[PDB]
Swiss-Prot record, chain A:
Species, as recorded: Homo sapiens
Known function: Component of the 26S proteasome, a multiprotein complex involved in the ATP-dependent degradation of ubiquitinated proteins. This complex plays a key role in the maintenance of protein homeostasis by removing misfolded or damaged proteins, which could impair cellular functions, and by removing proteins whose functions are no longer required. Therefore, the proteasome participates in numerous cellular processes, including cell cycle progression, apoptosis, or DNA damage repair.
Similarity comment: family membership: Belongs to the proteasome subunit S3 family.
Gene that specifies this protein: PSMD3
Protein name as catalogued: 26S proteasome non-ATPase regulatory subunit 3
Methyltransferase keyword on record: no
Annotated positions of the Phosphoserine modification: S365, S377
Protein's GO biological process: proteasome-mediated ubiquitin-dependent protein catabolic process; regulation of protein catabolic process; ubiquitin-dependent protein catabolic process
GO molecular function: enzyme regulator activity
From Swiss-Prot, chain B:
Homology family: Belongs to the DSS1/SEM1 family.
Assembly behavior: Component of the 19S proteasome regulatory particle complex. The 26S proteasome consists of a 20S core particle (CP) and two 19S regulatory subunits (RP). The regulatory particle is made of a lid composed of 9 subunits including SEM1, a base containing 6 ATPases and few additional components. Belongs to the TREX-2 complex (transcription and export complex 2), composed of at least ENY2, GANP, PCID2, SEM1, and either centrin CETN2 or CETN3. Component of the homologous recombination repair (HR) complex composed of ERCC5/XPG, BRCA2, PALB2, DSS1 and RAD51. Interacts with the C-terminal of BRCA2.
Organism: Homo sapiens (Human)
Protein name, entry field: 26S proteasome complex subunit SEM1
Primary gene name: SEM1
Assigned keywords, A-Z: Nucleus, Proteasome
Subcellular location per the Swiss-Prot or TrEMBL entry: Nucleus
Parent-protein start and end of this portion: 16 to 65 of 70
Cited function: Component of the 26S proteasome, a multiprotein complex involved in the ATP-dependent degradation of ubiquitinated proteins. This complex plays a key role in the maintenance of protein homeostasis by removing misfolded or damaged proteins, which could impair cellular functions, and by removing proteins whose functions are no longer required. Therefore, the proteasome participates in numerous cellular processes, including cell cycle progression, apoptosis, or DNA damage repair.
UniProtKB/Swiss-Prot annotation, chain C:
Source species: Homo sapiens (Human)
Modified residues (Phosphoserine): S13
Name of the protein in question: 26S proteasome non-ATPase regulatory subunit 8
Any single Gene Ontology cellular-component annotation: proteasome complex
Residues annotated as signal peptide: none
Keywords: Isopeptide bond, Phosphoprotein, Proteasome, Ubl conjugation
Superkingdom assignment: Eukaryota
Presence of the UniProt keyword Ubl conjugation in the record: yes
Domain PCI: 65-205
Residues of the full protein shown: 94 to 350 of 350
Function: Component of the 26S proteasome, a multiprotein complex involved in the ATP-dependent degradation of ubiquitinated proteins. This complex plays a key role in the maintenance of protein homeostasis by removing misfolded or damaged proteins, which could impair cellular functions, and by removing proteins whose functions are no longer required. Therefore, the proteasome participates in numerous cellular processes, including cell cycle progression, apoptosis, or DNA damage repair.
Example GO BP: proteasome-mediated ubiquitin-dependent protein catabolic process
Assembly: Component of the 19S proteasome regulatory particle complex. The 26S proteasome consists of a 20S core particle (CP) and two 19S regulatory subunits (RP). The regulatory particle is made of a lid composed of 9 subunits including PSMD8, a base containing 6 ATPases and few additional components. Interacts with DDI2. Interacts with TASOR.
Swiss-Prot record, chain D:
Protein name (Swiss-Prot/TrEMBL): 26S proteasome regulatory subunit 8
Subcellular location: Cytoplasm; Nucleus
Recorded superkingdom: Eukaryota
Portion held of the full protein: 20 to 51 of 406
Subunit (UniProt): Component of the 19S proteasome regulatory particle complex. The 26S proteasome consists of a 20S core particle (CP) and two 19S regulatory subunits (RP). The regulatory particle is made of a lid composed of 9 subunits, a base containing 6 ATPases including PSMC5 and few additional components. Component of a complex with USP49 and RUVBL1. Interacts with PRPF19. Interacts with TRIM5. Interacts with NDC80. Interacts with PAAF1. Interacts, in vitro, with the thyroid hormone receptor (in a thyroid hormone T3-dependent manner) and with retinoid X receptor (RXR). Interacts with ERCC6.
Primary gene name: PSMC5
Membrane-spanning residues: none
Biological function: Component of the 26S proteasome, a multiprotein complex involved in the ATP-dependent degradation of ubiquitinated proteins. This complex plays a key role in the maintenance of protein homeostasis by removing misfolded or damaged proteins, which could impair cellular functions, and by removing proteins whose functions are no longer required. Therefore, the proteasome participates in numerous cellular processes, including cell cycle progression, apoptosis, or DNA damage repair.
Organism expressing this protein natively: Homo sapiens (Human)
Family: Belongs to the AAA ATPase family.
Amino acid sequence: KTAAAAAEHSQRELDTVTLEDIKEHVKQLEKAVSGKEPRFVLRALRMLPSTSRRLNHYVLYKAVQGFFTSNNATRDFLLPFLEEPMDTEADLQFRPRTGKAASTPLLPEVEAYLQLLVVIFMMNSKRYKEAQKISDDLMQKISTQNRRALDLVAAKCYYYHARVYEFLDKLDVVRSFLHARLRTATLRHDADGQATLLNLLLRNYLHYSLYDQAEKLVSKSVFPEQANNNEWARYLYYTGRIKAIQLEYSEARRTMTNALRKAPQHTAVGFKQTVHKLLIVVELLLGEIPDRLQFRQPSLKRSLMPYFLLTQAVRTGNLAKFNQVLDQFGEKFQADGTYTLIIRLRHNVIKTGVRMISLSYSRISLADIAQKLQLDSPEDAEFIVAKAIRDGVIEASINHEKGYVQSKEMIDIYSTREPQLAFHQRISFCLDIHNMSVKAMRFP
Amino acid sequence: DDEFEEFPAEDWAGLDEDEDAHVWEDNWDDDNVEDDFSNQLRAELEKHGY
Amino acid sequence: MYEQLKGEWNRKSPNLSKCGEELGRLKLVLLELNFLPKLTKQQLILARDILEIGAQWSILRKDIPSFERYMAQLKCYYFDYKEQLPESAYMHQLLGLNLLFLLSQNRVAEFHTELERLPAKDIQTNVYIKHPVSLEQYLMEGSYNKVFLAKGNIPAESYTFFIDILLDTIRDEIAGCIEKLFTEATRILFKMTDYAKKREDTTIPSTELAKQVIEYARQLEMIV
Amino acid sequence: LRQYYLSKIEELQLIVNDKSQNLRRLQAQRNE
Amino acid sequence: GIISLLDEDEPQLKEFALHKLNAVVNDFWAEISESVDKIEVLYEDEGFRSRQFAALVASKVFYHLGAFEESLNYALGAGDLFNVNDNSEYVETIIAKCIDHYTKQCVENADLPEGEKKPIDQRLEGIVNKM
């Protein structure tokens, strides 16, 4: 079959390209170790997903035999544990390391890189037992040494280990290692390791709904600002979800919009869908109409269509429509992770209406407002308007003597003393950008 | 450059025949419940004529 | 195992009058059987059941803080420190009282936090959570009257030990009212007059602005 | 004391490098 | 989640609770930090018999939080509890900070050795000699 020969040729080409690339990342690691410049290791992490799957088990075994020519204890211990391949006559002699290069032991950076590559390979293989064992061995190998350069790849190593363990539903088991390793990173101040470790520690509670624990771990912990964009986006998403479930809404919405903007524009379709969905529910709960622009995006269309229906129903303020939409889409809502806040909406609907009325009018007779918001009582209207003022959604003082509902006054602080405070934040941020730019000029 | 495999990627849920949507770009107030305009003035007017 | 003997239930004003047949229950047995990780499945059987009645006791005795020293386990137990098997009170006549306490004070954080545990039967209802939950759904909007009216819908354990304790906050809250009805008082509350007993702009900020501007200048001319 | 003595060396090595390339930056624009 | 049990006034009961807690202190430190008041009060209560264990627990809590000065102080209050202890991450960090502190104090004496010497706790010297 010519198809089999073509596939074998393609696999051989991919393996050769991958060996060349692995040599390139090894050279990058050597340069970063020599010059204390982890920029190359950041590049390797950035391009790490691209090299997820281009080899085979036998190719990996031959590569490891050729590379770890040094009498490395890690390879010595790992080889017997690896399943012994069947006797094969075809064994290419791959000896890139000769003389000084061969004598020099292979760096733990390279060892971890190759190990995590095997992790990705047998991960797509879904080889959970060996994944876990290899992760544990990697954990011991990292713990033996205390070099910062290792953590650069070790962070994604932990990430992949956690992802493997999630399938096994062993989060309650991982938590111990996660907490301990976070403590160690904190005692060493490893920025990226800390970022990923905090992220996964939060993710555990999020899936297990230990929200009080999550609040503890978010408030008491400290997130360094120099973290990566992706980890920042994850942190913002999880924090936004926690706050939104926590009945605090303004900060949650602000943070969620900031994260969504920070999130990749074209990648992470599902994750972007989830973040948009949580932000949509939060906004609707906070009595603000969302942006209709999103609900037409092709990238996030069908995962939201139920939410488009929900937002239209809430705006129209039709109880029958809201009940029917819930009755039709409760299962999807549960699946998404928004049932609690939607149950909150199911009685908080009238807040959006009070906000819209108090924003469109400037003085409404209380009987008129009662007729507007279908309450059937001036007393009920008075209570509701007092509630609107209390919650801080409207800024009108109710005068229960002439049915007045007096809105705000004439020109506000936003033309008297507000613009200066507004400009101060902008100027601080711009100067900060400039200072970071100048201080990040160059090494040589 | 991250796959950002947080975990989920919605599988289109109820993927069905395309509704064809509409290339026009529409704000929120676009779809409401109403009884047209001419009929509006018609149920209007009367009395003294509106 | 001091098995039972606390079978006072019936009606001894103090669950066991003296802590002897009461607190003694655990006293130090508290330590004995395992309470930190099939095992003492019987201790598990009396889990905090050793004091479920004791938690009920506190409420059966206007002992309030207590539940706070109590939730620890009934919660751990009904939150299931470990999925066991016998849980017939907090899934029904109880927990929802924690819910009462989840606001009773006035706080909400928790009220809405734990409300994820009650997995799904919350909306599926159970006579229990339903009312403990209906209150906030029927109070957050501001429909204060939505409850007082039939607030007597208490299909569970007393709960009265806080339903009023909470119905108290409403009073103080609704009292909040364009601070600063003449003598007619609020019809949702009106005891008579015992409630009457109950009770920059013009200077441009010079120093702060000077500080901020000088900081601008400092950062502008600074480490070359 | 490899746990600690090595702990201090890294604690005062990675940081001190940042004061190495900083010296060039201050050296670079000076000549310019 | 257990401070509710810890609230009892039985000395032996509270000591039992604390020994139960110290197993999971390292993993529930997040919340436990909200329970610093009770532990600090218990340690301040000199009459308590398990003051050594209370000091150990509080030093551990502060170590997790990050206030290493407080963590070292609580270790010093603990005294001989960790002197036997030699091989562990928390003890390693504690000894790191305490040895650095002894370094600084000795340096201060060296720069100002004209009497008025700052009293170096005998526990510091004992731990330095252990190392």
